[model samples]
Target: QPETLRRYRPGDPPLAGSLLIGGSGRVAEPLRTALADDYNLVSNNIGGRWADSFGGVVFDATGITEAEGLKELYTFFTPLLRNLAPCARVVVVGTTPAEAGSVHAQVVQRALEGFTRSLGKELRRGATVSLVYLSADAKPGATGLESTMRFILSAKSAYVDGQVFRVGAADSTPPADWDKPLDGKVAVVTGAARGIGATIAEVFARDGATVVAIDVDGAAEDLKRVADKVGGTALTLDVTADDAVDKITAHVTEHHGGKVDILVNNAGITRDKLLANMDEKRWDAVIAVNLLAPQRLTEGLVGNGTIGEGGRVIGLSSMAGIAGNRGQTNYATTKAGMIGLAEALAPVLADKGITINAVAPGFIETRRLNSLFQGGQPVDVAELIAYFASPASNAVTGNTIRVCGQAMLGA
Candidate 1:
């Protein structure tokens, strides 16, 4: 049996064991200073020789701009692999390919993706490995990396493994209180009646966001309960309706401070059928609810000033979208489209100080049958979404990260 993964608990320690920092890249010193206050920190240069176990290890590969420099990765990690504690976090930081300047630099940076993914699979006992590509223009040092680092290092990212994230350069301010990063934001989460949607609403509230929970009329009672539990408002309406956007806008204006700083396009439906057996009704219904509705709603909200500058738009894609599943043609199409939407909108929205991204969850325990044998929890998806909604994630956009525990197909 696979080892049970360590997950986030309300009052667990920030980290379970000592942290190791490797490499002398631009991100190292600042990262060390940021975590010095809380973690038992060690570095490859000195104290790293004595630490027998490490809960987290961060390697900054920004200086390795050529193929020959790739050897540094092995040198840093080879001796440390056995020292990683169960559920330990490993992050390899590299320069974003576009900003690496030369073809040689770009190739080396891009290679980190494959290295981390393969290492994640090799790791047992629930350990995870991920890559972070920092844009050269991002705020110098840890300002842009602190939040991503925190999430990846802690138990919050329990189900996130073998993923790649790009942090862009931005002038956005960090939250005054790290624990409650969403303190003054107003967020809208669709399909917030049950499962991952409801969990997302709860997590947002915990982070201090004023949430607006939306779902179809059929789930009105459950939606109301979720809204009440979160001290948020509920909107019972079909997302596919022609007046859906109008209703959402009016609801926010009347009850939610007239602004939506975060928009989570989580309302989706699956119509499973092979292409040969699929009918127009199945395909159209799935398209309307899962894909078109998000497009229409996002266009409306972003077009109006409601979701203005510093706004966040997060789409919920699925593992099926990344690695197509049998009898899910309709569902996979919509899920893939969500990722496409984020890629298409990132550049345009960047000019407005807005960001767009997507998260593709794999075999969350919310469903049945997973290749990992043990599926992930709903909290796994919620946690990732919460990170995306935070102001600290201003530098992270246009990335579709999978919240899968290093599942085979996608990895």
Candidate 2:
């Protein structure tokens, strides 16, 4: 049997055991102080002996400013890595190359990626590893660090392995309460009828957002059930329709207090066909729903101030976009376009205190597929989005991250 990742349950303890804090970097003290209340703290040298166990390890690699200094990683982690608790998490914090200044320092900082990615594969029994590059100018405060730290060190990040996250300066407000970060916010999720979209809606509502679940008219019944179950309202409308943006804006104004804070462009479809056999209908439909609709919907909301400052926009891209798949020329093109969308819009939106990100889920498990083979769960994808939707990820933007269980195929 495969190992089960200890996932998030309401009101559960932040960790099953102690968290070991290592490294002498500037962030070490702040990060330790931030997470101390929720987790048992074990300093690197105070863990008794080489065989002591830990639920997680966080190494602040920002102090390692040169190639020669990188050896500190091996020296510090050599013994500790042997005793990590099952499903343990390891995170390395470093300065972004742009902030590292000199070329030598930049190269050294960038080298942390190789260390974390390689270490992720070396760990076992559900343990995961990741790297975080913090802009030197960004004062993440306790809130910003905690948000990223909590997600990377928790079961919420299961199925996300060997990933890299960049944190920049943000102009958004931190949530009053970390657990219910989405409280008082209005969220719109497309394709909320089933699968990943429905799960994203559920997670947002669980975190206290007023969710407006949207889907095509054909899934009206199922969409309503999802909305009702999550204490939200459902809108039956196709994202590709000419009036889609207006209908969404109007619905929020009338029923959701006239403000939208989070917009999840999760509604998408696949019309797979080899380039040689692809038809105009397949290409056009996929482009319309998966690519053009997000662009159209986003412009309408952002341009008119519906999704204003402190707002979030997430697009559901796929692994196909990163590693092209057979007979999916149309599908892959749209998926890749979603990535392009985030990259291009992030800087533009950042000026408005808004963030845009793309999530590329890889081989997530559904009942239909689980009956045959193994893969990640729908909740895996939802958890990451929940992080992005929350104020915790205020500084994380313009990223195309994958939730693939450390699959070897894609970069």
Candidate 3:
């Protein structure tokens, strides 16, 4: 008879644990020391007045470029992270060379985004990873560093992933204590069932807006969930339908008490067959859903007194539409049409106290793309959407902003 063997279960804690990989020469040490009590600190090649105060595990941190350093750090940290208690958090402190000057810093800083995004993609499951960029002018005791530290190490930035935020001279200023930025506002988001649409809904909700999520009948479940979670209303109607304009207007008027502060036209489709092989039905479907529907819906909303003063109208386009894609004639044409609609409507809508714009996203990670691309990493589309949705973006209108992460599309 075989002897019975006992199985071992690793003990992990519920609280927070952090790993600081590298640091900005003058700023990282004091910041790490300040938060040592609150977070379990582990370090590699980071030195400061409080270096000897806290103990976890330390490694030799040395790398020349942002990418090289990150690769090495991740290699060492990945194994250590396996032993971290469940829900343990990891914070990676990254630097942009102060000696590199503005131009070089800009290049390295931008490169940090890709590094951190890739890191977030590679970190172990149930563990959160974040990269904070500290400029040279900032000191270890700077207030901005403290605030950034809180955000990176605490639950405040829980859902935020793969972000590259700056800690500069103004970092020490007190943050606003106001309620969510969009509080008391009404926002309309089309294609809100999944991906970027769903992300937009969540952002508006987080900012305190009463969101109205719209999607076709096929996405009923996802749309319903987004609406419920965000305390918004969901509608299951095809935006491409002939009556789409009327139905959307009616819904907004009745549900929102006849006012919509924001309108996001995010519904779009792609028909990838080459022009020669693409049938008329495919071309028409793409145009109807991507271009015609948005125009009709915006017109209906504006005409019916649904969109109010200072309102914003946003449309989603694509990189393929701008630069053109092989085997995607129908999609490209319709996307290009969206850009035209935005320009045409911008001036007209501005007269009515509204701003109109469109976003041409590139390689965004959507469910459709996930299926189409066979699991390749999709660009972070949420970041671009957030920028457009921002109140500060009011000055931007009629402009078609590219959200393609600098893809090879040159149009």
Candidate 4:
């Protein structure tokens, strides 16, 4: 079998070459300013002359909420698809429905989701697409948009496809240094013993969080190994246990002064069975470990005031939950529930200045995809989680972002 996987390494170009096209009003100068520092930007103001050699295309649809204006994307990009380089990217930025301020405007702004998702599936050569809905409250400047723009355009978003994010109108604050966005913050990650969980633990650490890696006692050896490697502390505790939050809270209080800046609900389980063949024991086990564990822990952390102001709570969902899988009724149910949790908790947490989101991954290179056909790596999920964990996503909440390699899942 031939092996073909396009992965990124350090020192590679940030973007091969990027072309920015304004379909609406010109971007605020700060956006262009940020782009100049991050991308080899070639503005197609006079004409789009870089189509054939471009690695990135950022289509700005700000203030455009009409059929005539939106069709420009189809007209312009359809011809440019074949001209894209390998692992190319397409980013669509829109003024959100709330910002549109009119029914017609809202309708047109919402239409980008359909357009971007379809475009994501259409692009070949390992290219991907994403939609970033900017809130009406945020100004068109660097504080609100630049950090997010950098993440979407970089190699870090390699395996994320067809996902939508809402960047609420935020008074964007540029991180003094992007390299240490999480500097001095305290974070807690569950199920950090191996696989995806371990990878997230390290990614957060690399971004400068003081990590507390937690897992079940059985995985203590491996968990401690990973924590040691990341310069973090490891705690052995089953998340499903009632005492999990109490223990985690105590640890953070004593060591980090009762402040939990970030919480990752990465621990999950599977009990596959067709509904007819499934028993209550199977369903209960999956529900407790996959659903209730995270929910209870979050409730405790937030209710007891352990999750500090500006904190983040991220959950791990699955593609099976987004698109139901055979014999995975129990597993799918709990995963889908996380999506609900994110949506319901978003507004509530927004009041507290905290953000809640979920990441639903497709067939990753784990047992789920059998290491064949599934080209996504654990770090792919970790990188997406790290972005959500960062201040760059300050205006973002209540989103279920996917890290699937454009997997054809049911709507």
Candidate 5:
């Protein structure tokens, strides 16, 4: 028979019988205080630091590293935990390496994965082990710490072991409640037939926004299907055409009651060519579609008031634009121009109560990228786009957020 699940009653404390490691750091303090009223907290005192009086004895093991730290951790606490209730909980927290230019730091940070996995394997069946990678920004009163701490301590993290995650500064001050941050908002995403664009459109729909999925005539069927699935509308309008902006504005006014909360300039083209062999026609065509079209659309939105106040204008950029890629001169130039456009328009757009930004995705899995880079998948790219569209991403504007997973050799 399968093991029975542990169920908690209302007002029951989460820490009824648990021992928490690293009880002095930012996460530890908040977690301990939050559960102190409910659980028997076993604290650790590294280096004779002031003990905050947990329910159990304090283990001092400060300034320890590698095997020494692991030795102290297992030897001192294993027996105490074994003597506790049949089911004991263990929470391990450690700081991530600083963003310093140190090779050793990277090695040490990477080693945490191995350490945490090994510990989980050695722990008793009823005992649980969790590791939290605290980023430098997550130190003391940083954003997202409370919610992050809750996730780490609760049973929700059960069955999740040998995992590592970063705790950074909160993305926004208002805080995201996750229920319905974008309720009643309207979002329009171009090239929504598939790939990253489709992901963005679906995300907006999931957030309770009226999504408008726009694509080229070739993708009309797919766009319609996506629109139907999300209860949105699909339009076959080439964003590069002269009349594209006008059509989009008219559609918003007529269908959305003149409110366009978000406009994502996701449609783009690539005419790859080596500089020496490239002709002006190739360069011009790519620029017209990728750069000029976005500029015109943005201008139309601002001048015609299609984009409502406090709206957003997001553009797609690429890592090729950051570090010049071979045989992609035209593509890189257009992508680079997007950054300039976003920067130039941010302050101006801010005056109108709107925010403009761009994302330079790296190694995204899309048909076009896969064809160009070989074997790239769409899900890989969708994750970064979701982050950019998240409600918590408001304070980030006028910046070219790199979604490349740190895959850049030079600026």
Candidate 6:
């Protein structure tokens, strides 16, 4: 099912469906080795054409540091654009601007950003293009290269497009167990009664995390069901209550020695109304449940010093806050505030070996949407959350990644 699941865009195929690796320079072989670990190696060398349609195309330019080199790249990819399938992925990797030796080299390196972004716009359908600016030091065993490549190449990064990543360090070995990266990690997911939150809890547990699936007292039944489904524990508590943080902290302490490896502030509510029609009660309720609850939990644990090293705090934001939807002033304010929470908390957690980030999703297809769909676009938001939850995203922090499948272009 995963091999055939389509991410974004109608008529699009699966992840790396008939992928073709091309281009030359220093990084080609290394990049190939990294990708080949998880995908089939297909190229125009010692072989016949795999297929007429290409789902993913990668062009490596780690050795290119001049204008002529870039021009040749343009010529090589122009002809193959028409053959790219809907929702296909294309990535161009080069040297980072700061690592360049000369002015011309720096300019050409920086120009890759323009080229990739324009390429994203030029590509029709739902196909998205991305660029990676890596350091020259990223040799055969580069740090953070595999994880970065996996994210950019996989459908787990469905909504991430036209973005550039600067990876300086190099990692040699893969995670001990890629299948279950969170072997003994403790994860807490709020609003886990049903829908996306429930999906997240299940996915986390499937990946070997001891998930604490939490929700309000009234939804105890549904929350307990999700916990049983994931082989996790269900906790019934209103996160907006004064003593909620204490209970959560105690659960982590008793279950896993006070080490909160993963914290997902997924509990959110919407009180939709225009600014003129929205009441203060509605505004306050939305803010308290969506923004204040998560802030209090993070500060209560992180401030007093209990969260583990290498911890991850992921906040769930919405595209409404990013693009500003209609009749949702109260809801949008809370969602926008979540982004602020992640940004400010990032620097504070940087010294403590923890990372904070947010995901602003657009038009997610929940369980109900699945029944109505004829099966074209994907509704696999759980996979994206799983990425942030695992060590695969160790280098990523202090950013807001959209799970909107290129529906709305926002940072």
Task: Evaluate all candidate structures by whole-model CA lDDT and list the values in order.
Answer: 0.86, 0.84, 0.59, 0.79, 0.60, 0.72
lDDT for model 2 comes to 0.84
RMSD of 4: 2.9
Candidate 2 matches the true fold with a TM-score of: 0.95
lDDT of 3 by residue, 285-311 (tens): 888888888888888888877886667
Please, what are the lDDT tens digits per residue for candidate 6 over residues 14-127? Answer: 364666777776667777776675665577644334565677888877667778888857766876787787667888888878777788888888888878877876665557
Each candidate structure's TM-score, on Cα atoms with residue i matched to residue i, is 0.95, 0.95, 0.55, 0.91, 0.60, 0.82
For TM-score, the strongest prediction is 2
Model 1, residue 225: C-alpha shift (Å): 1.0
Q: Mind giving the per-residue lDDT tens digits that candidate 4 earns over 300-341?
A: 899989996788999999888888899999999899999988
Q: In candidate 6, which residue pairs clash? A: 142-170, 142-171, 143-170, 143-171
lDDT of 2 at 349: 93
Lowest lDDT sum, 10 consecutive residues, model 4, at: 366-375
Put down candidate 1 lDDT per residue, 179-286, tens digits, no spaces: 788998999999999999999999899889999999998899999999999999999999999999899999999998888999999999888888999899999999
The C-alpha local distance difference test score for the whole of candidate 5 amounts to 0.60
Model 2, residue 251: C-alpha shift (Å) = 0.3
Q: Model 5: how far is 277 from its true place, Å?
A: 1.2
Candidate 2 per-residue C-alpha lDDT over 1-411 given as tens digits, one digit per residue, 9 for 90 to 100: 456778887887666567988887878888888888878887666545644467789888888878999998998888788779878888899988878878888999998988888898788777888898887776645345567788887778877888888887553356788778889999999999999999999999988999999998889999999999999999999998998888988999999888899999999998888889888999899999999999999988998888998899999999999999999998888999999989999999988988899999888866112211237888989888888888768788898888886777674
lDDT of 2 at 34: 81
Task: Tell me how many clashing residue pairs each candidate has.
Answer: 2, 0, 3, 5, 3, 4
